[PDB]
Design an enzyme around this catalytic site. Structure first.
Site, PDB file in Angstrom:
ATOM      1  N   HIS A  63       0.727  -1.071   0.144  1.00 35.65           N
ATOM      2  CA  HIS A  63      -0.118  -0.030  -0.007  1.00 35.65           C
ATOM      3  C   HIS A  63       0.787   1.174  -0.077  1.00 35.65           C
ATOM      4  CE1 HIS A  63       1.036  -0.717   4.220  1.00 35.65           C
ATOM      5  NE2 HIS A  63       1.083   0.745   4.290  1.00 35.65           N
ATOM      6  N   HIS A 142       5.063   6.720  -1.558  1.00 33.67           N
ATOM      7  CA  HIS A 142       5.767   5.569  -1.968  1.00 33.67           C
ATOM      8  C   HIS A 142       4.853   4.366  -1.599  1.00 33.67           C
ATOM      9  CE1 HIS A 142       6.597   5.881   2.372  1.00 33.67           C
ATOM     10  NE2 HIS A 142       6.728   4.837   2.502  1.00 33.67           N
TER      11      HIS A 142
END
Ligand SMILES: [Cl-]
Length: 211
Positions: A63, A142
């Site tokens: 995620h 990220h």
């Protein structure tokens, strides 16, 4: 998404196939990196099987976090979730673009380059450490692929920002080589970046983490 109901964090949770694809791209990167002559040449500046070194992979799907909320206790949690676009984006599908893979002595990760639409879900009230300065909001975005021994995934933020700062100031250096799917850059201090020839597109659902 009222205060009582807030998650530990909000973020884009990659679909199962996207998660698999990116996890596998990341293991291939770590294996190919650890075997590349430039990296082995720089071993002193890093400490070897990078897949195992970065074995700490939290359980579940990869995620990209947006807002840490601490179930409504964290500063700005309520105000983040109060935003109409958050409410309207909960449960909705997104495509995230990955532009690079990176490695530091502390984390391995995928840099996400958010669209304008996705930036509307990026918090405006994040702390602004020195490494974020001059970088537009969202540069931190990220997907963490792995962490070292006793690293806290909040470290991934700061490692990426430090890498992006170095690139921003022209010290990216010349490519030291090519790995499958991109060009390999050495940034020093154990920091490595695979700039991907083509962005990697992953699919994800915007939702809440309630572990
Ligand atoms: Cl940022």
């Amino acid at each position: 998404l009222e205060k009582d109901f807030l998650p530990l964090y909000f973020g884009w949770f990659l679909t199962k196939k996207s998660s698999e694809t990116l996890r596998k791209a990341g293991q291939v990167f770590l294996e190919e990196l650890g075997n590349h002559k430039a990296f082995k040449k720089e071993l002193r500046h890093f400490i070897l099987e990078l897949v195992s070194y970065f074995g700490k992979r939290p359980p579940g799907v990869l995620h990209c976090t947006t807002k840490f909320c601490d179930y409504g206790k964290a500063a700005g949690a309520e105000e983040y979730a109060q935003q109409e676009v958050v409410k309207r984006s909960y449960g909705k599908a997104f495509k995230l673009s990955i532009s690079a893979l990176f490695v530091t002595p502390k984390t391995a990760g995928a840099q996400v380059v958010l669209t304008d639409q996705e930036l509307q879900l990026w918090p405006s009230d994040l702390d602004k450490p020195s490494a974020s300065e001059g970088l537009p909001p969202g540069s931190r975005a990220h997907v963490t692929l792995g962490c070292a021994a006793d690293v806290q995934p909040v470290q991934t933020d700061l490692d990426l920002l430090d890498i992006l700062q170095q690139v921003k100031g022209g010290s990216q250096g010349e490519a030291v080589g090519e790995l499958p799917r991109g060009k390999l850059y050495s940034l020093g201090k154990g920091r490595w970046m695979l700039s991907l020839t083509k962005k990697m597109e992953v699919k994800a659902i915007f939702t809440g983490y309630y572990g």
